[PDB]
Amino acid sequence: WSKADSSKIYCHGIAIRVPLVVGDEHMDTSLALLEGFSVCENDPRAPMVTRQDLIDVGFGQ
Amino acid sequence: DLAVLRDEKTAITKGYEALIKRLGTGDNDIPSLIAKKDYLSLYNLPEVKLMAPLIRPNRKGV
């Protein structure tokens, strides 16, 4: 799926329709990427990591 | 004066230094306690109590 066509959901190329309409219910994906995290502004200083070491991270980090 | 590290790593190093200085002779030190197998009194030392604030707080128990 992609924005600008959020009323559609592809399945092997088969476009499906949504019985509803949304313009913001999807725009907020800050919590759909990881479990106990949230996206934030880009920062190159921050170090690259994996999905495992995540457990030993803190807050404001 | 002849150092470039920040207060954090310097604090860690000084904590380790202080914790080592307790490696001397006399009771209340780690050698006597090891000989007596008092592995518990080590947890209550003051030096670990001064280095504790540096520990990651969200996983310090584990």
PDB file of C-alpha atoms in Angstrom:
ATOM      1  CA  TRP A   1       0.000   0.000   0.000  1.00  0.00           C
ATOM      2  CA  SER A   2       1.043   3.614  -0.398  1.00  0.00           C
ATOM      3  CA  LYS A   3      -0.188   7.112   0.304  1.00  0.00           C
ATOM      4  CA  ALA A   4      -2.030   9.112  -2.370  1.00  0.00           C
ATOM      5  CA  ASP A   5      -3.927   5.829  -2.963  1.00  0.00           C
ATOM      6  CA  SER A   6      -4.639   4.870   0.650  1.00  0.00           C
ATOM      7  CA  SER A   7      -8.114   3.687  -0.363  1.00  0.00           C
ATOM      8  CA  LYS A   8      -6.402   0.732  -2.062  1.00  0.00           C
ATOM      9  CA  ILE A   9      -4.569  -2.345  -0.789  1.00  0.00           C
ATOM     10  CA  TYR A  10      -2.634  -4.508  -3.236  1.00  0.00           C
ATOM     11  CA  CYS A  11      -2.424  -8.287  -2.823  1.00  0.00           C
ATOM     12  CA  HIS A  12      -0.178  -9.834  -5.497  1.00  0.00           C
ATOM     13  CA  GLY A  13      -1.112  -6.824  -7.604  1.00  0.00           C
ATOM     14  CA  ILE A  14      -4.826  -7.369  -6.955  1.00  0.00           C
ATOM     15  CA  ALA A  15      -6.058  -3.948  -5.858  1.00  0.00           C
ATOM     16  CA  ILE A  16      -8.689  -4.147  -3.116  1.00  0.00           C
ATOM     17  CA  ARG A  17     -10.928  -1.365  -1.834  1.00  0.00           C
ATOM     18  CA  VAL A  18     -11.580  -0.099   1.683  1.00  0.00           C
ATOM     19  CA  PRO A  19     -15.262   0.099   2.734  1.00  0.00           C
ATOM     20  CA  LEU A  20     -14.339   3.382   4.448  1.00  0.00           C
ATOM     21  CA  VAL A  21     -12.388   6.580   3.782  1.00  0.00           C
ATOM     22  CA  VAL A  22      -9.424   7.951   5.727  1.00  0.00           C
ATOM     23  CA  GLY A  23      -7.018  10.848   5.356  1.00  0.00           C
ATOM     24  CA  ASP A  24      -5.282  10.747   8.740  1.00  0.00           C
ATOM     25  CA  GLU A  25      -6.104   7.384  10.351  1.00  0.00           C
ATOM     26  CA  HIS A  26      -3.158   6.023   8.344  1.00  0.00           C
ATOM     27  CA  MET A  27      -0.905   9.097   8.331  1.00  0.00           C
ATOM     28  CA  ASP A  28       0.256   8.192  11.863  1.00  0.00           C
ATOM     29  CA  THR A  29       2.574   5.193  11.495  1.00  0.00           C
ATOM     30  CA  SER A  30       5.124   6.271  14.118  1.00  0.00           C
ATOM     31  CA  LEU A  31       4.189   3.169  16.144  1.00  0.00           C
ATOM     32  CA  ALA A  32       3.635   0.603  13.366  1.00  0.00           C
ATOM     33  CA  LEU A  33       7.362   0.104  12.684  1.00  0.00           C
ATOM     34  CA  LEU A  34       8.669  -1.140  16.048  1.00  0.00           C
ATOM     35  CA  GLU A  35       7.023  -2.325  19.253  1.00  0.00           C
ATOM     36  CA  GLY A  36       8.135  -0.045  22.085  1.00  0.00           C
ATOM     37  CA  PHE A  37       9.615   2.778  20.029  1.00  0.00           C
ATOM     38  CA  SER A  38       8.521   5.771  17.988  1.00  0.00           C
ATOM     39  CA  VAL A  39      10.028   7.465  14.967  1.00  0.00           C
ATOM     40  CA  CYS A  40      11.751  10.808  15.474  1.00  0.00           C
ATOM     41  CA  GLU A  41      13.626  13.421  13.481  1.00  0.00           C
ATOM     42  CA  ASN A  42      16.606  12.196  11.493  1.00  0.00           C
ATOM     43  CA  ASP A  43      19.988  12.394  13.210  1.00  0.00           C
ATOM     44  CA  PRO A  44      23.189  10.946  11.705  1.00  0.00           C
ATOM     45  CA  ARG A  45      25.036  11.169  15.025  1.00  0.00           C
ATOM     46  CA  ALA A  46      22.840   8.390  16.382  1.00  0.00           C
ATOM     47  CA  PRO A  47      24.540   4.995  15.974  1.00  0.00           C
ATOM     48  CA  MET A  48      23.243   2.230  13.759  1.00  0.00           C
ATOM     49  CA  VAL A  49      21.947  -0.804  15.646  1.00  0.00           C
ATOM     50  CA  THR A  50      20.097  -4.088  15.159  1.00  0.00           C
ATOM     51  CA  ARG A  51      16.804  -5.523  16.392  1.00  0.00           C
ATOM     52  CA  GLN A  52      18.469  -7.500  19.206  1.00  0.00           C
ATOM     53  CA  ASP A  53      20.485  -4.888  21.111  1.00  0.00           C
ATOM     54  CA  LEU A  54      17.264  -2.847  21.313  1.00  0.00           C
ATOM     55  CA  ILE A  55      16.571  -4.501  24.665  1.00  0.00           C
ATOM     56  CA  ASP A  56      19.563  -2.798  26.316  1.00  0.00           C
ATOM     57  CA  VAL A  57      18.678   0.744  25.229  1.00  0.00           C
ATOM     58  CA  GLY A  58      17.473   3.494  27.533  1.00  0.00           C
ATOM     59  CA  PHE A  59      15.260   6.562  27.201  1.00  0.00           C
ATOM     60  CA  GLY A  60      16.021   9.836  25.488  1.00  0.00           C
ATOM     61  CA  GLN A  61      18.553   7.819  23.475  1.00  0.00           C
TER      62      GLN A  61
ATOM     63  CA  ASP B   1      45.161  18.939  32.777  1.00  0.00           C
ATOM     64  CA  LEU B   2      46.789  16.420  30.419  1.00  0.00           C
ATOM     65  CA  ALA B   3      43.537  14.722  29.485  1.00  0.00           C
ATOM     66  CA  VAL B   4      40.942  14.980  26.729  1.00  0.00           C
ATOM     67  CA  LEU B   5      38.204  12.642  27.984  1.00  0.00           C
ATOM     68  CA  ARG B   6      34.874  13.905  29.281  1.00  0.00           C
ATOM     69  CA  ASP B   7      33.501  13.785  32.815  1.00  0.00           C
ATOM     70  CA  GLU B   8      31.652  10.530  32.093  1.00  0.00           C
ATOM     71  CA  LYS B   9      34.523   8.237  31.126  1.00  0.00           C
ATOM     72  CA  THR B  10      36.732  10.022  33.650  1.00  0.00           C
ATOM     73  CA  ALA B  11      34.154   9.330  36.359  1.00  0.00           C
ATOM     74  CA  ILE B  12      34.045   5.665  35.348  1.00  0.00           C
ATOM     75  CA  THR B  13      37.835   5.453  35.464  1.00  0.00           C
ATOM     76  CA  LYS B  14      38.032   7.147  38.863  1.00  0.00           C
ATOM     77  CA  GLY B  15      35.340   4.848  40.221  1.00  0.00           C
ATOM     78  CA  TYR B  16      37.330   1.833  39.067  1.00  0.00           C
ATOM     79  CA  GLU B  17      40.461   3.335  40.634  1.00  0.00           C
ATOM     80  CA  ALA B  18      38.730   3.870  43.980  1.00  0.00           C
ATOM     81  CA  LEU B  19      37.290   0.352  43.813  1.00  0.00           C
ATOM     82  CA  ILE B  20      40.787  -1.027  43.248  1.00  0.00           C
ATOM     83  CA  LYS B  21      42.337   0.971  46.086  1.00  0.00           C
ATOM     84  CA  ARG B  22      40.199  -1.225  48.360  1.00  0.00           C
ATOM     85  CA  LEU B  23      42.397  -4.139  47.223  1.00  0.00           C
ATOM     86  CA  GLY B  24      44.799  -3.557  50.122  1.00  0.00           C
ATOM     87  CA  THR B  25      45.164  -5.303  53.458  1.00  0.00           C
ATOM     88  CA  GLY B  26      42.913  -5.197  56.482  1.00  0.00           C
ATOM     89  CA  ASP B  27      39.356  -6.262  57.150  1.00  0.00           C
ATOM     90  CA  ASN B  28      36.535  -4.487  55.308  1.00  0.00           C
ATOM     91  CA  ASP B  29      38.642  -5.072  52.185  1.00  0.00           C
ATOM     92  CA  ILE B  30      37.865  -7.581  49.453  1.00  0.00           C
ATOM     93  CA  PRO B  31      40.762 -10.003  50.172  1.00  0.00           C
ATOM     94  CA  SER B  32      39.772 -10.704  53.776  1.00  0.00           C
ATOM     95  CA  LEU B  33      36.139 -11.064  52.721  1.00  0.00           C
ATOM     96  CA  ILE B  34      37.070 -13.513  49.962  1.00  0.00           C
ATOM     97  CA  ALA B  35      39.081 -15.535  52.466  1.00  0.00           C
ATOM     98  CA  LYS B  36      36.000 -15.509  54.710  1.00  0.00           C
ATOM     99  CA  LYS B  37      33.756 -16.104  51.664  1.00  0.00           C
ATOM    100  CA  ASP B  38      31.605 -13.111  52.651  1.00  0.00           C
ATOM    101  CA  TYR B  39      30.511 -12.486  49.072  1.00  0.00           C
ATOM    102  CA  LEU B  40      27.583 -10.452  50.432  1.00  0.00           C
ATOM    103  CA  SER B  41      29.426  -7.636  52.217  1.00  0.00           C
ATOM    104  CA  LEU B  42      30.940  -6.710  48.847  1.00  0.00           C
ATOM    105  CA  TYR B  43      27.546  -5.634  47.506  1.00  0.00           C
ATOM    106  CA  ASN B  44      27.303  -3.045  50.301  1.00  0.00           C
ATOM    107  CA  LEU B  45      30.655  -1.346  49.713  1.00  0.00           C
ATOM    108  CA  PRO B  46      30.590   2.446  49.322  1.00  0.00           C
ATOM    109  CA  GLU B  47      32.522   2.478  46.051  1.00  0.00           C
ATOM    110  CA  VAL B  48      29.919   0.453  44.174  1.00  0.00           C
ATOM    111  CA  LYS B  49      27.411   2.818  45.776  1.00  0.00           C
ATOM    112  CA  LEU B  50      29.221   5.749  44.136  1.00  0.00           C
ATOM    113  CA  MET B  51      29.490   4.070  40.730  1.00  0.00           C
ATOM    114  CA  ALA B  52      25.867   2.882  40.725  1.00  0.00           C
ATOM    115  CA  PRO B  53      24.397   6.165  39.359  1.00  0.00           C
ATOM    116  CA  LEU B  54      26.349   5.508  36.163  1.00  0.00           C
ATOM    117  CA  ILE B  55      24.491   2.237  35.549  1.00  0.00           C
ATOM    118  CA  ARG B  56      21.740   2.046  32.962  1.00  0.00           C
ATOM    119  CA  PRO B  57      18.679   2.463  35.220  1.00  0.00           C
ATOM    120  CA  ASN B  58      16.157   0.496  33.146  1.00  0.00           C
ATOM    121  CA  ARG B  59      18.134  -2.773  33.376  1.00  0.00           C
ATOM    122  CA  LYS B  60      20.228  -2.321  36.512  1.00  0.00           C
ATOM    123  CA  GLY B  61      18.468  -5.117  38.376  1.00  0.00           C
ATOM    124  CA  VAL B  62      19.029  -7.778  35.738  1.00  0.00           C
TER     125      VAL B  62
END
